[PDB]
Symmetry: C4
Subunit: 475 residues, 4 copies
């Protein structure tokens, strides 16, 4: 600490006094400032392209309910179920002929696929497919049942008529059926070339309609699910790259300011490699047992790891982004996360340069000194939260509605310790007030015991653990 | 305390130092650790069987609305009410003929019951039953009314036609009717042998449809309620016990690790029987008046009573669980509570072994020293909560909706002191702004006075009583 | 204070030590204990009678929508509005003939009224009544309009046919109409003699159906409102007073225990009349200027005024209650408040006898010493709450929905400072995002400024004002 | 401070002692008191006129759905969309003929416009207008597409028949269409002369109905939007200004009490001009460096700037208000804000005269001394709030519903840090549990990380920063 002190003096300056103590320009700092205004614009200019490309996937699904399902209304997609025998027939037949008579009745200008896949042959594109147990004979009240699990794949195909059948001959064997599925495809031309302002892309759907019976109980859920798939196409349209060469040059400007940002922040951390061996030569281990590496973690540059973490995930989006043009990758998911997560790390990086004004120093530093004592209390409670979910996850599983699945129960109790959807979870049990009247006696004790523990006893400590950390640090 | 001290020294060790001070293995401890991973799997492997067996009870009820009720739509089951004279007829007749013409129109493969019960004879299975006052003659505006309570059980039965009537002759006497009920049964074969992967069970319903009039006011609620009943049946199906003998052997492994857990925890408490008489021989009652038995309650092993409480309720489920196979008991309720409650006591048992790290010692111990002062404040408030329900329980009883029943009001105010369903309870009165305008003047003062008392005055003490207990114990 | 001290010593005893210091029995106390178990049963035994007598008023209103309104469905009673010209006709005509053809089509056994009132004559019971401006002639785009306010009461009556017309000749003058109303009555026999178990009462409705146009804007709200009126009737039914003489004798037992309760509590306060003049003779005003009468308010018996307030309102219900039998009063409102409010004052009277255990003494007494400082802060805020309602009450009046009326806005902001119906009040403006786009710019600043003031700045003082009162009183 | 002290002594008196130390009447004060009772009545007497004049704009929009849209029901205005080819036709044709056959079928007494505007000619008033790409030819699966953006304005007009066509010849070219719009107008006479009690105004609508397709995806949203426009008209009606000259004279009384209020409050601040130069002559800058102008901001009259701000905005409403009579301005928006904002500043002006009672002095002054330390903490958090919106604003943009637009996300998170609409935002993702299953893995971490930061860590400091300011100021 004779000559190390002035060498370590530069290692904990402010940004402001160091500029006057040495005289080197804050471009090493202010590149962080401009890349805020870079990447935020990069997100929103991605955001106009994404928000269009999902509504095209969305609206064509909403449309295909109102073409291929008899008597569909909006809203409930689960209550739509066929009960009678003939409504299973009529929903099938009303789904078949719309596929047959499509371009005379539809608006949207679609085209048939002429497939060759594995639930297809060559020539046909639609396929309805019965599924039932091969070897079996069941009867109640004179009880005998063979439930030999073996499908009977009766994929009775049908071709489309193109240009200006025996599916009527159909039986279903309702005592034995498992499910009836219907596969086909349609091609389309997406036509949302407003914000691109030029060349669009050319998409391909695949529609499944399922008359499922995994219940054998007299109710058949009727569903529609799609997947959209994308490829490229040949255009005669005119004057593409006008402002559209400018976005590509702009993404270079995006990848300009991040490129040198990786270099200097590593070079700033490279100084730590040059200082960590000098400290050990404090009179050539005259003490020696200072070294325990957690005190060296303060000697490690702290929040510089955050900026370099933001920077790697930043360039991983823009590299992935320019695959929108002529690469087979067009899944906008991984562009959304990587340009979504990296923007979250940029804005929190400015916090480090916010804590040098003294009335900003002493407030966020409370979160630094509390989080050791926070994490140690937190493991006491999180046993009990997890230990309390597994009771209601099967006990109040089917009887309730919002305690059905795996992760929704983990949402439901944690939503209930703040005060939203609390009374409705009380009220939904009371239709079972006499029906399974023992279980309502348990659920009423289940929710009364719970929030009396977390809200009225635990979270009061969770205030007083943070109130202390502000209290100790201001004196 | 000469030789007692080292004998009592072992009585408040940590688990860790005792292993090195004597040298006996922590299998006495770690059986608690593995039975976490036992019973939690036992719950979820019960959970796949239960969640299927209620949806079969659920979906067949949802189906039987859409067969036996004219013009039923989903959602509201209470607003469905017949007002005219003939809609009482048409709903009956549309309920009758579906029972007659069932297997030609339904999917689900049911069978008739050919009953012999007390609202039955032998031969018929359906019975509609008028109910009215025997001796009476009423007339408004020339006022005379005999309301002699005496049923007229006119159970006009009807048989089913099985294999490839005068209920039309029916009058109801609408000025005198009480209610019209309809009883029948149906058998079924549950066919959810996916997760069993082999042999299913064979069920039996009983359906009641009630055209109730306990109002005599021109509206007839129409309802449907079932009960499911289970027995066994003879199977030709093949290769049952493949992985299904393995679950039975697994339940022995469940009842393995709990069996010895009862033994050793009692033996640990058996040491207390060997130490409680030695302490009294502290120089042969040289003091004597130490003994007041609450100080002996700390000398009582504290949380060991919790594990033995968890263990007895654990084996009471698995014994009850193996009655799924070939015992007449099949009510999954008491298996759900006992494998539900015992799992809640397991996870909280680990808390005891969590409080020996010193920053875990001093946080949950606050709840120990506060709960005396908590319980004493709590009896002051809970008089007022109960003393405030009984006002609104009949005053705002019929005028409101969510203040109707007994226990829902106890839910409603306690939901209202946190902040869910608060504004809607204000808003529902304002349709009675002129109609009974005095009562809305009371309800507006009812809810304004209330949360100004509990939220703004009482619960602030309920924070400051717990904040103190953290404050005193950290110095 | 020589001989006054022992005389004032009895004036602040506990209840417990005074029983041993003098030896007089606690029947003076325990009558408060038993009247808890009296009046609470009196409320609930009133509650079975009230909850039936409103559902009869309720269900007959719900029924008369489904008879007299064309195409009514449940739920919305405001959106039901006739737009076309002929749907005003068809709803009238479908309301007329149901009144004509009632007993052949209805269940409920009603009877016609044969009225003689002021919008009636003798002979007819139904009356439809046009209302329009007498002297006027309006025309847009060649603009001239006389809006002389003068009704034209064209009450075209019609009689009913009783026992086994020219309303068709009707024009309405749609350019000039104000509203069309329809009056009639029906009698009934309430038949809910289950919990009385004997003699019922005989009721009378009056139904108004209004085709209002206070808008002249092309939409006519269609409404139905009733009033129920009660009188008595002659019965042939048998064995009335079996357990029904027992309730009358029970109400004497109710008015037994309250009667002497007024006497002794006044006599306890009568001691204060005997002590207030003795204190002034403290050495014959040797000081004199002690007397300022607020220190005498502690010398006033404090919570004894509460019991006597509960007692007067208690007997005012039971006196009012026995008018159910044979008095013209049958309005259950004032029985509901007076047996509702008096029960609230009984349970809070027990609190006084709860604060002598020392860990109960020092907790509710905080509310005593804080409420001076509470009320003084409270007048600072309640200016601002009232000063903030009047902005949104007309500015966000019609544009919103839940800021419409007078007192609902006073509900709405106070519901919004806790956290229910908060986001929906934000979201409802965004349909006016472009339509009146200036006003949404104001509402977004209206709700952002507000809860940032009360929740984040004011209510934090409202915790710290109560936390102090617990803090000062425990040292 | 020799003679300045008594001169500055008057500068910080109370209002009460100054009245006795000099003897000048508090009319200088009490004009603030009466203008509370002035302007509040002025708001509400404006409020009766405004609340009528928007319902006339409201109800005629609600009516025109039920005339011009086939099969419209109430509630959802977005789900109403035509899917088939002919339902686009039938909704157009059912919109056309109602415009043709209006006065025989409607109630409301409208009149046609006989327009001459830019999407009009002279003679016709209705115009339907196709819009499609001029030069283009598209085809999927043999891919070629020309998307040359050029409208084809085929506004096929049509006249009305007035007094007692070839739009049938119509094709739409569905493969090429952009949108179909329909313009017309209607005049009306508002007839809500109840609270004016005399002369009404004469209005003019303009209705647009849009069959938009900015999607080209097989769904056409169908919408209706209006704008109301007002002018004046000639009346024969009688006895106008009875109480209506009295309101005009009352607005002078409103502008009376505000007029002198500007004068004296400025004159009170004019004293500051007479005192600010005297203080500098404190022994002719014997110190001099006191002067830093923030200490002079306390020497600036503080809350007097608030009253003069309220007063200027007060007269700007009433001047704007009397343009209701005979000026072309009739937009009630700017009267609503200026009579809405100025009332908010009046009631908060009374607060200054509330803080001289000593238990009122020391409570609101906490907000004065905290707000420096509040604002400095607040800029640390508001970076993170804004830095966290931009992630979810495009990532959870289309996948969610309530994260769609720009400013609703800013509402949504801030609604979520208090506890309303919290669980529903969790639950809406789980329909995408398998569909884009990666993104739900991100949203579940998005909302778990968030409120664990603001609610459980940040806002606890936000209590402890205000609790301190009450704590320091009371000692
Ligand atoms: C979110 C944070 C805040 C804290 C301490 C108040 N807290 C709880 O209130 C209860 N709680 C769980 O039992 C839990 C388990 C798994 C995920 C999230 C949670 C969860 O919210 C908790 C507990 C464990 C881990 C994290 C937390
Ligand atoms: C749940 C616990 C928490 C505490 C103290 C805050 N608290 C209340 O806020 C009000 N309150 C009752 O009047 C009450 C009565 C019966 C069951 C549950 C409750 C109930 O929640 C209360 C009062 C009595 C007994 C338990 C409690
Ligand atoms: C209910 C009590 C609690 C307290 C102090 C927190 N508080 C408010 O938060 C705001 N507030 C009003 O401006 C107000 C005005 C009229 C009736 C009720 C209220 C009302 O709740 C308030 C203010 C004035 C009078 C009473 C109260
Ligand atoms: C309303 C006030 C209260 C305070 C401090 C608790 N607080 C927040 O909790 C979070 N927060 C924002 O990130 C934010 C950004 C823009 C407008 C409003 C807000 C906003 O409410 C905040 C933060 C920044 C500016 C004002 C505020």
């Amino acid at each position: 600490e004779e000559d190390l002190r002035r060498r370590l003096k530069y290692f904990f300056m402010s940004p402001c006094d160091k500029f006057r103590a040495k005289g080197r320009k804050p471009c090493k700092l202010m590149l962080q400032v401009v890349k805020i205004l870079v990447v935020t614009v990069q997100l929103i200019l991605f955001g106009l392209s994404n928000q269009l490309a999902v509504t095209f996937r969305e609206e064509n699904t909403i449309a295909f309910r109102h073409l291929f399902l008899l008597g569909y209304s909006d809203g409930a997609d689960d209550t739509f179920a066929a009960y009678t025998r003939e409504q299973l027939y009529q929903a099938i037949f009303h789904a078949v002929d719309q596929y047959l008579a499509l371009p005379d009745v539809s608006l949207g200008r679609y085209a048939y696929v002429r497939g060759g896949g594995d639930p297809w042959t060559n020539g046909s594109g639609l396929a309805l497919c019965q599924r039932y147990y091969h070897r079996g004979h069941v009867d109640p009240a004179n009880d005998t049942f063979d439930i030999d699990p073996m499908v009977v794949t009766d994929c009775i195909q049908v071709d489309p008529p193109e240009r200006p059948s025996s599916y009527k001959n159909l039986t279903l064997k309702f005592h034995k059926l498992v499910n009836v599925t219907i596969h086909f495809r349609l091609k389309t031309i997406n036509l949302q070339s407003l914000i691109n302002n030029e060349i669009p892309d050319c998409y391909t759907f695949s529609v499944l309609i399922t008359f499922d019976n995994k219940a054998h109980s007299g109710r058949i859920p009727i569903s529609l699910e799609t997947q959209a798939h994308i490829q490229e196409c040949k255009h005669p349209s005119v004057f593409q790259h006008g402002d559209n060469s400018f976005r590509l040059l702009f993404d270079v400007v995006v990848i300009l300011t991040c490129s040198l940002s990786f270099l200097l922040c590593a070079r700033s951390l490279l100084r730590g490699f040059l200082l960590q061996n000098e400290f050990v030569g404090f009179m050539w281990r005259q003490r020696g047992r200072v070294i325990s590496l957690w005190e060296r973690l303060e000697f490690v540059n702290g929040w510089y790891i955050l900026l370099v973490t933001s920077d790697v995930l930043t360039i991983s989006g823009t590299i992935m982004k320019i695959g929108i043009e002529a690469k087979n990758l067009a899944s906008y998911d991984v562009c959304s996360i990587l340009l979504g997560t990296s923007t979250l790390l940029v804005w929190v990086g400015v916090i480090r340069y916010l804590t040098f004004f003294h009335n900003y120093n002493i407030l966020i530093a409370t979160l630094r000194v509390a989080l050791p004592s926070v994490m140690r209390f937190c493991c006491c409670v999180a046993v009990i939260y997890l230990g309390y979910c597994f009771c209601g996850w099967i006990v109040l599983g089917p009887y309730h509605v919002k305690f059905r699945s795996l992760s929704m129960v983990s949402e439901c109790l944690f939503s209930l310790i703040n005060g939203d959807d609390m009374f409705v979870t009380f009220a939904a049990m009371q239709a079972q007030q006499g029906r399974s009247s023992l279980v309502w006696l348990f659920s009423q004790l289940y929710l009364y015991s719970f929030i009396s523990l977390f809200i009225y006893m635990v979270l009061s400590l969770f205030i007083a653990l943070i109130t202390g950390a502000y209290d100790t640090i201001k004196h």
